[PDB]
Short mmCIF file of C-alpha atoms and ligand atoms in Angstrom, two decimals:
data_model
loop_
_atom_site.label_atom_id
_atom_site.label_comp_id
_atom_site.label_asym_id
_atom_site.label_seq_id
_atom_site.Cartn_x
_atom_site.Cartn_y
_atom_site.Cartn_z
CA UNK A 1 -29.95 15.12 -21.16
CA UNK A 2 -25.98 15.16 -20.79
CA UNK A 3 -23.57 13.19 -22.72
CA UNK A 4 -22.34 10.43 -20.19
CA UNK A 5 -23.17 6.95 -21.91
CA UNK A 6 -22.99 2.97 -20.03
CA UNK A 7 -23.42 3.94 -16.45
CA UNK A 8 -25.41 2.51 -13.62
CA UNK A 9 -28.13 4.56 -12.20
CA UNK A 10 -27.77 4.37 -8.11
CA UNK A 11 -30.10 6.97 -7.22
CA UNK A 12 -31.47 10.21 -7.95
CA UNK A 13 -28.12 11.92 -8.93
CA UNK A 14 -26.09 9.28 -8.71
CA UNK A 15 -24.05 7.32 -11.13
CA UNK A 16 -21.60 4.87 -11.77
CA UNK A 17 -19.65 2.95 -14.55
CA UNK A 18 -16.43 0.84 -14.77
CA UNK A 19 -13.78 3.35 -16.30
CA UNK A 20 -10.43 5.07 -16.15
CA UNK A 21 -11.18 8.97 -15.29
CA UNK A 22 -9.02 10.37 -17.85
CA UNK A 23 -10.59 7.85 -20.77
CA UNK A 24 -13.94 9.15 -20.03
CA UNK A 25 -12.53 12.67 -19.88
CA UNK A 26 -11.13 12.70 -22.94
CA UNK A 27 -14.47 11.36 -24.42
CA UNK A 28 -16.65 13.27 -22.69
CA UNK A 29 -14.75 16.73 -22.46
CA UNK A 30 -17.17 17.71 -19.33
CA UNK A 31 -17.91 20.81 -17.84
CA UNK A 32 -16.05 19.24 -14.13
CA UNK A 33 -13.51 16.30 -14.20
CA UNK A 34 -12.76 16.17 -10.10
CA UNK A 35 -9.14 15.54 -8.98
CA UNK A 36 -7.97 13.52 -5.92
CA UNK A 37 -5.89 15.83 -4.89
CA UNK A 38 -3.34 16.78 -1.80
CA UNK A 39 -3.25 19.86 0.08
CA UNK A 40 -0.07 20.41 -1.90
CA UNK A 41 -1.88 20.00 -5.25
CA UNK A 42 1.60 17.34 -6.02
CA UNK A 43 -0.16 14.98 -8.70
CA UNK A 44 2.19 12.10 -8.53
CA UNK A 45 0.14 9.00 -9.05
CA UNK A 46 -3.69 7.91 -8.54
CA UNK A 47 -6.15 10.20 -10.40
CA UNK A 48 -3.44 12.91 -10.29
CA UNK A 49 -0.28 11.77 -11.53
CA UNK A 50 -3.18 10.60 -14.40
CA UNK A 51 -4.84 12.84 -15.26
CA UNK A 52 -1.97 15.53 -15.18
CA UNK A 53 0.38 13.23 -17.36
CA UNK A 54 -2.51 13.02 -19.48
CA UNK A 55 -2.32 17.26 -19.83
CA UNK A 56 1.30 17.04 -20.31
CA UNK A 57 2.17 18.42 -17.02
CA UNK A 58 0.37 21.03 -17.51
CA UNK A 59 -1.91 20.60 -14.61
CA UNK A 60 1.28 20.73 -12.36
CA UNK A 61 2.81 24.00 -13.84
CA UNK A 62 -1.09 25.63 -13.12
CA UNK A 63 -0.39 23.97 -9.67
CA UNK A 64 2.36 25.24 -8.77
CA UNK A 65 1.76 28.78 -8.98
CA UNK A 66 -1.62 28.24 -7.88
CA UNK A 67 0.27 27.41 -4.76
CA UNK A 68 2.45 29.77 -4.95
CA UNK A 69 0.19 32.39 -4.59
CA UNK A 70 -2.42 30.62 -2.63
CA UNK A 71 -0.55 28.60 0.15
CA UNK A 72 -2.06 24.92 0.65
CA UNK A 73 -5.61 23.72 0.70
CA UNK A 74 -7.17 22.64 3.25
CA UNK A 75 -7.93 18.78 3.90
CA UNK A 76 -11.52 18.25 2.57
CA UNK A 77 -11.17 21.51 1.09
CA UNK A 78 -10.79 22.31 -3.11
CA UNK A 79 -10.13 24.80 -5.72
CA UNK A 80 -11.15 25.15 -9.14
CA UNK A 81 -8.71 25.16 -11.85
CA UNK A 82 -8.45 24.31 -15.73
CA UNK A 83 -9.67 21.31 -17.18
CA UNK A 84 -6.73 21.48 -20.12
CA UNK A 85 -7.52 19.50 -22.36
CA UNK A 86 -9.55 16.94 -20.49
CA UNK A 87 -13.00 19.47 -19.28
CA UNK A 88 -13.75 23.15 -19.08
CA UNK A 89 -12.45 22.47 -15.35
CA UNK A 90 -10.47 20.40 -13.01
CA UNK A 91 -12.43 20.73 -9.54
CA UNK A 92 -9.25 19.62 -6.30
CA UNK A 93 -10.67 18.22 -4.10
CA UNK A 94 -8.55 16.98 -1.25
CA UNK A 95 -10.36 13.47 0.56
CA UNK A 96 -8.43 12.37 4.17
CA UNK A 97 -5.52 10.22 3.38
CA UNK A 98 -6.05 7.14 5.49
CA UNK A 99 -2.14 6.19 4.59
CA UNK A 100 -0.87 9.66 5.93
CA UNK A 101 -3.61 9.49 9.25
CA UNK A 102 -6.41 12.20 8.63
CA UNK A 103 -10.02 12.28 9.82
CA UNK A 104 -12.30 9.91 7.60
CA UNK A 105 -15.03 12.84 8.98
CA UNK A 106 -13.59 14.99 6.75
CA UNK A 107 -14.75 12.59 3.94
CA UNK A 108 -17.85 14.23 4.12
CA UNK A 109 -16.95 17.93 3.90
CA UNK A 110 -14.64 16.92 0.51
CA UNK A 111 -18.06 15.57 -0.70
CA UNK A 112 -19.72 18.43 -0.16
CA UNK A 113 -18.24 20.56 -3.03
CA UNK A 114 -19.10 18.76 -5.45
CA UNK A 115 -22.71 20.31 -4.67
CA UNK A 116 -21.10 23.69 -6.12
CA UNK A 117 -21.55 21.84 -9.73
CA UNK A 118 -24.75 20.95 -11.20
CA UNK A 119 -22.68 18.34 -13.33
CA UNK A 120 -19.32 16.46 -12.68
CA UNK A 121 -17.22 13.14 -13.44
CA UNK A 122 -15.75 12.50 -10.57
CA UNK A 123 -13.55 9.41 -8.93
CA UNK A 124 -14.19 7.71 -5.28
CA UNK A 125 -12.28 10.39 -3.23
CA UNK A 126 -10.53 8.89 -0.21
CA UNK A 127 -10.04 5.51 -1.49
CA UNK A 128 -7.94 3.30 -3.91
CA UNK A 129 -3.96 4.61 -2.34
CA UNK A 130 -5.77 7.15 -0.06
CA UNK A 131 -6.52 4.54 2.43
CA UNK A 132 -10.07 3.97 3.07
CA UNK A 133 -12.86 1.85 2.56
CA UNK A 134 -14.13 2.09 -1.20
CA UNK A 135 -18.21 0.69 -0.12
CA UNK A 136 -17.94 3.83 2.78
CA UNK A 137 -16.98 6.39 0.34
CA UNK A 138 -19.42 5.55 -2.19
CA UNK A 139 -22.19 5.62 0.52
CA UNK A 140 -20.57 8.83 2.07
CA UNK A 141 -21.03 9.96 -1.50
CA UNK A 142 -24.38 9.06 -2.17
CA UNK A 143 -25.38 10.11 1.24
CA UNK A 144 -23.82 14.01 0.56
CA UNK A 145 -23.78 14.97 -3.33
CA UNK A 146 -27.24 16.25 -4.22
CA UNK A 147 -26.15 17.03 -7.87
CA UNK A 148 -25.51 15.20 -10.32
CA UNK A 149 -22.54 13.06 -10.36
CA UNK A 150 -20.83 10.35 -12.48
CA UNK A 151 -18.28 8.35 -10.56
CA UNK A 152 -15.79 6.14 -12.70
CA UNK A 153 -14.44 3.26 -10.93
CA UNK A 154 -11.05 2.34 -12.70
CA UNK A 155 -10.47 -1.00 -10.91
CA UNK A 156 -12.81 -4.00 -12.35
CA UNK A 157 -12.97 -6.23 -9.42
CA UNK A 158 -13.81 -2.94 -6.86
CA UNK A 159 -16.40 -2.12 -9.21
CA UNK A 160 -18.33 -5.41 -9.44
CA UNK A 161 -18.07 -5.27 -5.18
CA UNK A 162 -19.59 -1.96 -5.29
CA UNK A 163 -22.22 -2.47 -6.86
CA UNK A 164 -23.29 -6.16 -5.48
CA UNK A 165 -23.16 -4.33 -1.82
CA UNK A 166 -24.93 -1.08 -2.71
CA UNK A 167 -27.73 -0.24 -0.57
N1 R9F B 1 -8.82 5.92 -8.78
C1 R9F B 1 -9.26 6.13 -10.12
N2 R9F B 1 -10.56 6.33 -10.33
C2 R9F B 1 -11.02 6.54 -11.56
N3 R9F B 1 -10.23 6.55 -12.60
C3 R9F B 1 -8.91 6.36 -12.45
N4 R9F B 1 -7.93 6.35 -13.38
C4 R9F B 1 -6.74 6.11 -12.78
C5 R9F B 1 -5.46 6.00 -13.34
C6 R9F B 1 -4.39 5.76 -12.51
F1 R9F B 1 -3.16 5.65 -13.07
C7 R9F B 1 -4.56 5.63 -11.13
C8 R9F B 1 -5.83 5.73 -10.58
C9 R9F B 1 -6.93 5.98 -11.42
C10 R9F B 1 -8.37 6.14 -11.21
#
């Protein structure tokens, strides 16, 4: 039993609920809140600009020298970092940018970190200002996490067409 409350059971390990990210982080405090993140780890809006303003930039300064020392990630790539003072920790994870012209293949291989956590609250990498098709990247989703995962949807309308078109 975890502590994740209102969502919609998809399948096995899947989940999903109506809800801004960094509301249910704050709530929740879990063990993995995933970022949308860029290979530069820059959070200036979606989930990132978000979810750092919502550490007090405090995400970004960890960034930074996270880059610093680390170079860029790699697109579908990730890194582990701090939650602050949203979860015990923020898992990157960098989705194709549809807007910038990556590889929706890669959608997969960001997917498949998330399997490195038994647990996580995650968003709907890929989509929203990243460019692609929200019903693809939940089935992408579906289709790759094996553990258990608890996707927030922050926009109302998207979420009610998710759902009615899940397979
Ligand atoms: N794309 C998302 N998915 C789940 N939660 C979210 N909260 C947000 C807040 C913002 F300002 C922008 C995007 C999201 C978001």
């Amino acid at each position: 039993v975890n502590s994740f409350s209102g969502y919609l059971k998809l399948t096995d390990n899947v989940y999903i609920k109506n809800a801004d990210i960094v509301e249910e982080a704050k709530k929740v405090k879990p063990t993995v809140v995933v970022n949308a993140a860029n290979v530069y780890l820059k959070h200036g809006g979606g989930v990132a600009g978000a979810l750092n303003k919502a550490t007090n930039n405090a995400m970004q300064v960890e960034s930074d020298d996270y880059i610093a020392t680390n170079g860029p990630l790699k697109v579908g790539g990730s890194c582990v970092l701090s939650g602050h003072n949203l979860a015990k920790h923020c898992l990157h994870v960098v989705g194709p940018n549809v807007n910038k012209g990556e590889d929706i293949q890669l959608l997969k291989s960001a997917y498949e970190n998330f399997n490195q956590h038994e647990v996580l609250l995650a968003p709907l990498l890929s989509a929203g200002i990243f460019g692609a098709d929200p019903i693809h990247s939940l089935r992408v989703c579906v289709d790759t996490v094996r553990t258990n995962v608890y996707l927030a949807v922050f926009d109302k309308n998207l979420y009610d067409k998710l759902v009615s078109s899940f397979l």
